[PDB]
From a paper:
In that population, activating mutations in the epidermal growth factor receptor (EGFR), a receptor tyrosine kinase, are a major cause of non-small cell lung cancer (NSCLC).
To further explore the structural basis of cooperative binding of orthosteric and allosteric inhibitors, we determined co-crystal structures with mavelertinib+JBJ-125 and naquotinib+JBJ-063. Finally, the repositioning of F723 with synergistic inhibitor pairs also constricts the exit tunnel to the allosteric site, which may enhance the affinity of JBJ-125 and JBJ-063. Overall, our structures show that cooperative combinations of ATP-competitive and allosteric inhibitors assume the same putative cooperative conformation driven by a π-stacking interaction between F723 and the phenyl ring of the extended allosteric inhibitors, whereas other combinations either sterically clash or induce a conformation that disfavors co-binding. In all co-structures with cooperative inhibitor combinations, the P-loop folds downward into the space typically occupied by the phosphates of the ATP and positions the side chain of F723 against the phenyl ring in the allosteric inhibitor. This rearrangement provides apparently favorable hydrophobic contacts and π-stacking between this phenylalanine residue and the allosteric inhibitor. Pre-binding with osimertinib, AZ5104, mavelertinib, or naquotinib increased the binding affinity of the allosteric inhibitor. We observe synergistic inhibition and cooperative binding with a subset of third-generation irreversible inhibitors, including mavelertinib and naquotinib in addition to osimertinib. Here, we identify the 3rd-generation TKIs mavelertinib and naquotinib as also being capable of cooperative binding and synergistic inhibition, demonstrating that this mechanism is not limited to osimertinib.
Numbering used by the authors: 702 to 860, 876 to 985, 996 to 1006
Write the structure that this text describes.
């Protein structure tokens, strides 16, 4: 009952937020039949052709992605299956952290960057308890609800991010909770470099070759060595040598209580009912 099957006549698409090869994402509003409320939602219309055989496969995975309950993980709210499947989730008025961190390059402090690292690790730690592998962790897949509250989305999507995958994922298609730790390190690198592109100048056809010869992402200018060594431990060849999500929460939470020691940032020195693009 956590996944609600909506009728096509009870939600509206207003504006597209972006498109691609897996579907178009819209901004919209949801009014359940009877209830007298408006709910801002995001609607992702797929390109997958529906059918009694395919509809059963889509629905069964949509029930597990509606059963997550963590402050830093996004929950799937509803599905509409007609001649085209439409997925409905809550609208995150601030967008994704890649675009956010890139647009506020010159005004993000050490407290926000480290707190984002703790919040993302908590959401990935909960997914581990629920035995769900994300498989595509990146700064583009972290949504911002408020500047002090982020949530991870689009998990369990293997129903290609070569530069975010662990080495065992590139070579043998192995996706585990420890390969997610690798993707977490790259995501942290994105935040600490204010949205830079990883391995800039290297083709994706060479990423597997370049990692085994000993290459890693460089040390971000604002990070001390203590922050960088955590990120590098996420990129070890031996999967069981990478840190756990439990340990990452603890170590990054210790650094958040004295943020200026661990991040050198230029000019570094309740939230109830807040929006940004829910208007214009
Ligand atoms: C990270 C971006 C990205 O990859 N994509 C692909 C499609 C979209 O994916 C979404 N989007 C949303 N909702 C959403 C997207 C974008 C925004 N805006 C905010 C405002 C805009 N400006 C920033 C500041 N300037 C000054 C004025 C406004 C930047 C982008 C807002 C909401 C959602 C959702 N609500 O769940 N999900 C996805 C797919 C997971 C963008
Ligand atoms: C070719 N033949 C066709 C059918 C088979 C198939 C099986 C399952 C799916 C399926 C099911 C469910 C989802 C997804 C995909 C998915 O992409 N989903 C996201 C999500 O919707 N995001 C959003 N953005 C903005 C608005 S909705 C998502 C949202 C969320 F809130 C939490 C987690 C999550 O993964 C959910 C598709 C096709 C494959 C073989």
């Amino acid at each position: 009952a956590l996944l609600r099957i909506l009728k096509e006549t009870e939600f509206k698409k207003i504006k597209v937020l972006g498109s691609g090869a897996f579907g178009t994402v819209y901004k919209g509003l949801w009014i359940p039949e009877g209830e007298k409320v408006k709910i801002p939602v995001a609607i992702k219309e797929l390109r997958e052709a529906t059918s009694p055989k395919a509809n059963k496969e889509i629905l069964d995975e949509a029930y597990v992605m509606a059963s997550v309950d963590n402050p830093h993980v996004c929950r799937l709210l509803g599905i509409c299956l007609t001649s085209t499947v439409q997925l409905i989730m809550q609208l995150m008025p601030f967008g994704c952290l890649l675009d956010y961190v890139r647009e506020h390059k010159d005004n993000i402090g050490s407290q926000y960057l480290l707190n984002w690292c703790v919040q993302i690790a908590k959401g990935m730690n909960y997914l581990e308890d629920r035995r769900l592998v994300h498989r595509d962790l990146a700064a583009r897949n972290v949504l911002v609800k408020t500047p002090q509250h982020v949530k991870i989305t689009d998990f369990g999507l293997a129903k290609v991010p070569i530069k975010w995958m662990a080495l065992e994922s590139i070579l043998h298609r192995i996706y585990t909770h420890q390969s997610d730790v690798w993707s977490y390190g790259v995501t942290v690198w994105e935040l600490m470099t204010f949205g830079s592109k990883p391995y800039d100048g290297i083709p994706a056809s060479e990423i597997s070759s370049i990692l085994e010869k000993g290459e890693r992402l460089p040390q971000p200018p604002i990070c001390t060595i203590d922050v960088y060594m955590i990120m590098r431990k996420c990129w070890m060849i031996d999967a069981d040598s990478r840190p756990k999500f439990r340990e990452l929460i603890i170590e990054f939470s210790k650094m958040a209580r004295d943020p200026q020691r661990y991040l050198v940032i230029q000019g570094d020195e309740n939230f109830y009912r807040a929006l940004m693009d829910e208007e214009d």
